[PDB]
Amino acid sequence: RLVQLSRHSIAFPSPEGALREPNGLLALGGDLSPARLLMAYQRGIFPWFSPGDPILWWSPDPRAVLWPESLHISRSMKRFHKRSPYRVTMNYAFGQVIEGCASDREEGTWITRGVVEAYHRLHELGHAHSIEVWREDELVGGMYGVAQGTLFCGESMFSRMENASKTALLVFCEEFIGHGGKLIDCQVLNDHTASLGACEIPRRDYLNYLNQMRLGRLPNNFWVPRCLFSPQ
């Protein structure tokens, strides 16, 4: 049971054979090369592990997910946004966002130099993207993830100013839906993400969605770096 990946192949074991507790633990080892990483997202698997541990790959059951249209926005958040003090941009500073998440210290601590360089390559190659939230000239939050057709896999987010990451997601969902976005993978569910409207569906359901959506498509220029929302 369980399995060590080899530097030779880039193949992964079927997600369904993953462990029950720790939920999702499927395999360890391998590397974080673009090819293997990309392969993992294709198969509905993601790497996650603390510093000093060998690479760990997961595919939990259920799976956290967020339907873009079901994003919950408090009435005070709408009030806030209507007169928002933030500027949201896309792919303006991926390196700064991932670094921001990597400092969140509650658990951005798993984002080691190696993981950071790993998703940097995916960003250069055009698979990973980031949404930045600015307060005047300072980056006060954001989120990044691996795009996959009409599905988007959230990796992490951070906030240095009140409601920052909320608007990051708010603005993202609008843009996302408006252009054919269909689902947001939230990996593992937690309090913040759950209050935002995230929910859990069966691993096999998420996997199906994955297969139907990875084939989808968004405008050929959806991810080019641009501003999505400007303050007043």
Ligand SMILES: COc1ccc(C[C@H](N)C(=O)N[C@H]2[C@@H](O)[C@H](n3cnc4c(N(C)C)ncnc43)O[C@@H]2CO)cc1
């Ligand atoms: C569309 O825009 C976005 C962008 C980013 C996200 C990240 C989302 N907060 C999220 O998945 N937040 C999660 C994950 O990034 C990551 N994580 C993932 N798996 C685990 C795990 N195990 C499998 C044991 N243990 C601990 N942490 C894990 O930790 C965070 C909270 O615990 C969501 C949407």
